[PDB]
Amino acid sequence: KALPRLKQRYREEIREALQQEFNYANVMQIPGVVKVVVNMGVGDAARDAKLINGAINDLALITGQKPEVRRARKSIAQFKLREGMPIGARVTLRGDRMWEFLDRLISIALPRIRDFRGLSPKQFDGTGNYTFGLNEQSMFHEIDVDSIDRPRGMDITVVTTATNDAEGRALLRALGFPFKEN
RNA sequence: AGUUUAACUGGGGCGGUUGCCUCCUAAAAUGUAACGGAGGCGCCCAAAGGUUCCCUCAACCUGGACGGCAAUCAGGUGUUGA
Ligand SMILES: [Mg+2]
Ligand SMILES: [Mg+2]
Ligand SMILES: [Mg+2]
Ligand SMILES: [Mg+2]
Ligand SMILES: [Mg+2]
Ligand SMILES: [Mg+2]
Ligand SMILES: [Mg+2]
Ligand SMILES: [Mg+2]
Ligand SMILES: [Mg+2]
Ligand SMILES: [Mg+2]
Numbered sequence: 001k002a003l004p005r006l007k008q009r010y011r012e013e014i015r016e017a018l019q020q021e022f023n024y025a026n027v028m029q030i031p032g033v034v035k036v037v038v039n040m041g042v043g044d045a046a047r048d049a050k051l052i053n054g055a056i057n058d059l060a061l062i063t064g065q066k067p068e069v070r071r072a073r074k075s076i077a078q079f080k081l082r083e084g085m086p087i088g089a090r091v092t093l094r095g096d097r098m099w100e101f102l103d104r105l106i107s108i109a110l111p112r113i114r115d116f117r118g119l120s121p122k123q124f125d126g127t128g129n130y131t132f133g134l135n136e137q138s139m140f141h142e143i144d145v146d147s148i149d150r151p152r153g154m155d156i157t158v159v160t161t162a163t164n165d166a167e168g169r170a171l172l173r174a175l176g177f178p179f180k181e182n
Numbered sequence: 183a184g185u186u187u188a189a190c191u192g193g194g195g196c197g198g199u200u201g202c203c204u205c206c207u208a209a210a211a212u213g214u215a216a217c218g219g220a221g222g223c224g225c226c227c228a229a230a231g232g233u234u235c236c237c238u239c240a241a242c243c244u245g246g247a248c249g250g251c252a253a254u255c256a257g258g259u260g261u262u263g264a
Contacts, residue, residue: 034257041254070254074264079253088254113246125243129257132246153247159257168257 006099006175014174021170031128031161031171036098038063038156041088046081052089055152058137059091062154063101067091105156109139110178118178121169128162130172131155 015030024030038059045052052069059067069086081087093101110116114135123132137154138145162168173179 037254037256039254039256041249043249043253072253074252076252081253090254092256109246119246123245125245125257127243127258129244130246131244131256133249134246136247151248153249155246155255157246157256161257163258 004096004099004103006103007096009175014171017174018167018171022167031163031167033098033102034159034161036093036102036156036158037090037131038067038092038154039088039090040067040153040155042152043079043081043087045087046079046085049086051150051152052086054149056089058143058148058152058154059089061142062140063091063093065091065093065097101156102158104141106177108141112139114139116178118180120180120182121165124165124168126165128160128165128168130159130168131157 010032015027018024018030019027022029040055040059042051042055056067056069059065067089068091070088070090072081072083072085072087075081075083119132124130134154134156136151137143138148138151140154158172160168160171162171169179
């Protein structure tokens with residue numbers, strides 16, 4: 001009875017546009033976004049685990065889902081890290097949660113991006129993938145700026161079903177992220 | 183005053199060893215020496231035990247920023263090279 005505007009968009013207009021613009025043999029060659037990944041590894045828990053709790057608090061308030069933290073999958077003396085210390089916080093999505101969060105992000109954080117300049121095609125990998133790292137956490141609405149103690153990191157990435165980068169870029173710009181003009 | 187004050191030893195003495203475990207020497211059953219070649223043990227564990235269940239890496243291209251050659255990542259060749 002309730003469902004996200006991007007879900008509808010995908011069903012009716014994005015799918016039709018991509019089909020027309022690439023002449024797929026079948027309807028569903030249309031790649032579809034698979035997983036929005038939201039993790040973080042500070043690397044500072046090796047000296048103090050207090051900041052990890054705050055980062056997870058930010059992740060929970062941003063998502064409402066309870067992020068996990070992983071240990072030192074290997075151990076490195078140079079990084080002063082031993083296996084078993086928690087360094088990486090994760091929080092994942094799927095489906096309606098994926099696209100509600102994506103709509104909120106596109107509507108709020110992107111126009112809210114200080115000195116926003118658009119994102120380039122070239123950080124793809126040719127297989128329809130898209131991932132990079134957030135300047136600052138404070139960009140988000142539900143988070144409180146008066147309570148942020150130290151500027152820490154967040155990431156909410158997107159992925160595709162695209163076989164190559166061509167379809168990935170086509171559908172992604174159809175969704176309408178701010179690609180550069182070069 | 184009665185006694186003790188090791189053996190191995192390529193002469194003795196000084197060095198080193200003295201039991202146990204792994205490999206090679208070992209001639210494709212076992213076994214098989216040398217002061218031959220090389221390494222460890224005199225523990226750890228209420229779970230690192232039992233069982234049931236889930237699942238499997240690392241190699242890999244990219245980076246909304248720190249964050250770098252490497253921190254967490256997901257897309258999608260991935261057969262122990264972890
Ligand atoms: Mg894809
Ligand atoms: Mg006598
Ligand atoms: Mg003798
Ligand atoms: Mg002699
Ligand atoms: Mg001698
Ligand atoms: Mg034999
Ligand atoms: Mg003999
Ligand atoms: Mg020894
Ligand atoms: Mg058990
Ligand atoms: Mg992935």
